[PDB]
């Protein structure tokens, strides 16, 4: 189902490693549990859930074939947060700070994807 | 019958001020809303709720007769968190870090209480 590539290794050992240690990453460590968190409209609004714990496990289990998938999973995780929450909610400001770092690291990723 | 004392001024202008600025203080700024947060046994276990917003308002309005009463409210706030949550929960470690700062500040409070 997946491969080792230079870009995926970069996503794991640079992007995820950096983001996981960030002070604002913790709300994204696990899938949103709409029952425990009392979010009765979450699944009505969000049809493609994603979180950084799932992304990290996918990298550790070689689930991804290309880093493009891992980048899209990050995009989905962040966009879901903006769609569901108000622009003034702290979680949205945290997501934005994380996404800026994500984009900074993506700018520096190896530009050609090579299987390893 | 409240008072204005040297120690109460210290509780307001040193203790509350310092703790409010800490990155872990935000769960304690307002009373726990057990309904919103989906904690249905909260008030069964926690019969004396307390939070730092209440403490701050009490100091701002000369509610306390002595700083000892304000220290009691801080202890109630921290202990409620230690009681309700499980021992390894993040919020317990946050409360422990805040209590450490609280105790360090209390150690530097003027030792005799004088009404101003």
């Amino acid at each position: 189902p997946g491969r080792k590539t230079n870009q995926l290794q970069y996503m794991q050992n640079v992007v995820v490693k950096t983001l996981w240690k960030h002070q604002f990453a913790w709300p994204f460590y696990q899938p949103v549990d709409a029952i425990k968190l009392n979010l009765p409209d979450y699944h009505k609004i969000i049809k493609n859930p994603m979180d950084m714990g799932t992304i990290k496990k996918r990298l550790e289990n070689n689930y991804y074939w290309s880093a493009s998938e891992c980048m899209q999973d990050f995009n989905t995780m962040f966009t879901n947060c903006y769609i569901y929450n108000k622009p003034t909610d702290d979680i949205v400001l945290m997501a934005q700070a994380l996404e800026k770092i994500f984009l900074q690291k993506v700018a520096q990723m190896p530009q050609e994807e090579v299987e390893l | 019958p409240g008072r204005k004392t040297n120690q109460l001024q210290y509780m307001q202008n040193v203790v509350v001020k310092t703790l409010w600025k800490h990155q872990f203080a935000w769960p304690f700024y307002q009373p726990v809303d057990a309904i919103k947060l989906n904690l249905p046994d909260y008030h069964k276990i926690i019969k004396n709720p307390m939070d730092m917003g209440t403490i701050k308002k009490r100091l701002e309005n000369n509610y306390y007769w002595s700083a000892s009463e304000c220290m009691q409210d801080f202890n109630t706030m921290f202990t409620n968190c230690y009681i309700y949550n499980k021992p390894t929960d993040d919020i317990v470690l946050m409360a422990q870090a805040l209590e450490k700062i609280f105790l360090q500040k209390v150690a530097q409070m003027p030792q005799e209480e004088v009404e101003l």
């Binding site: 968190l37 702290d90 979680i91 | 947060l37 989906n38 919020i91």
Partner: peptide, 11 residues
């Protein structure tokens, strides 16, 4: 402004 955060923290 921190409610979802408090929920995540508690759960």
């Amino acid at each position: 402004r921190s409610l979802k955060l408090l929920k995540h923290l508690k759960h």
